[PDB]
Amino acid sequence: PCPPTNAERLHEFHRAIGAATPERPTPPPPELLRLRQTLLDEASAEVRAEIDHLLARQAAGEALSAGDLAPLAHELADLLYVTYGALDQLGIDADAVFAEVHRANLSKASGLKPEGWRPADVRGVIERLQHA
Amino acid sequence: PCPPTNAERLHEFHRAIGAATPERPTPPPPELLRLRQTLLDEASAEVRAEIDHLLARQAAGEALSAGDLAPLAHELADLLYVTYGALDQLGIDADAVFAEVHRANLSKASGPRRADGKQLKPEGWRPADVRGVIERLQHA
Ligand SMILES: O=c1ccn([C@H]2C[C@H](O)[C@@H](COP(=O)(O)O)O2)c(=O)[nH]1
After folding, report:
1. Binding positions for Mn(2+) 4 (chain B) (predicted)?
2. Which of B102, B104, B46, B29 is nearest to A44 (CA)?
3. In sequence order, what are the residues at sequence separation of 6 or more whose Cβ sits closer than 8 angstroms to the Cβ of residue B50?
């Protein structure tokens, strides 16, 4: 009926590979935080490498095609993958947190802050996630 | 209908600020790439600072609570926002790309693991065909 969200895909991946994926927000061991940092740094470096390639080709006058974007698109998705992966390993529903950030960002656009603007309250999202 | 995805939320956000983005994959101006790179670097640095802070509290002997994770979770979601933001400005359906990357990541399950925990690739592993995703979206 509906495809899984990208956040739910990360849950499937971590279960498939035996990586920690708690049901509820869970303070992690330092080894997990270190790995998440390393995976983010790896993905971030590949994105930058591909952006630099495209800028260098444009500087030389190349007319980029849609297909020329595929390496960059791949690395940007890898960066999503390990960003979702950090939230999943923390036991934090990424869609619930993203929804709150989106609420605050979109509400901010509807104003310059609008009158009763409420910034993102991720602590509240964390507390509600513990109590399902 | 199916609920909106986070990539669809970015498309909604870009329209709402009056900067509607392409519906199909579209090569961007160089200015667009340099701006998206800066946003990614700043969001990445915010995340790194929060991870460093949690690691420093743990190395001090402090016990983290779930509530202590909210600043990190916030900055990770901000990073999602600017990463999805980049794909949306390129006119590239993030969910289509992500689905194919996901399929190729699930096929790594039989591979070995690195000392830090990273899942590595088994022999015979084949990468995702993101060129095929872009081609499919471009014609469609
Ligand atoms: O432990 C891991 C190992 C790999 N990946 C995903 C992130 C990227 O989508 C892609 C990067 O893998 P490498 O190409 O760096 O091996 O696999 C993870 O999420 N967790």
Report:
1. 74, 78
2. B46
3. B71, B72, B75
For position B81, which CATH number holds?
A: 1.10.3420.10
**C-alpha triplet B80, B90, B86: angle, nearest 5°:** 20
**For the residues of A34-89, what is the DSSP string, one character each?**
HHHHHHHHHHHHHHHHHHHHHHHHHHTT----SGGGHHHHHHHHHHHHHHHHHHHH
**What's the total number of domains in chain B?**
1
Domain of residue B25, residue span: 1-140
In the PDB record, what is the listed experimental method? X-ray
Residues forming beta bridges with residue B119, ordered by sequence position: B113
Asked whether the beta carbons of A43 and A75 are under 8 A apart, the reply is yes
B89: its two tokens: 């400005």
Report chain B residues whose CB lies below 8 A from the CB of A70: 130-131, 133-134
Residue A122's closest chain B neighbor by CA?
Answer: B70
Resolution in A: 1.8
Q: How far apart are CA B113 and CA A19, in angstroms?
A: 11
Residues shown for chain A: 132
Query: For residue B30, how many other CB atoms are within 10 A of its CB?
Result: 15
User: Do residue A17 and residue B119 have CB atoms under 8 angstroms apart?
Assistant: yes
Overall size of chain B counted in residues: 140
Closest CA to B68 of A81, A40, A130, A99: A130
| Residues from chain A contacting residue B3 (CB–CB below 8 Å) | 2
Cβ distance A69 to B27 less than 8 Å, yes or no, reads yes
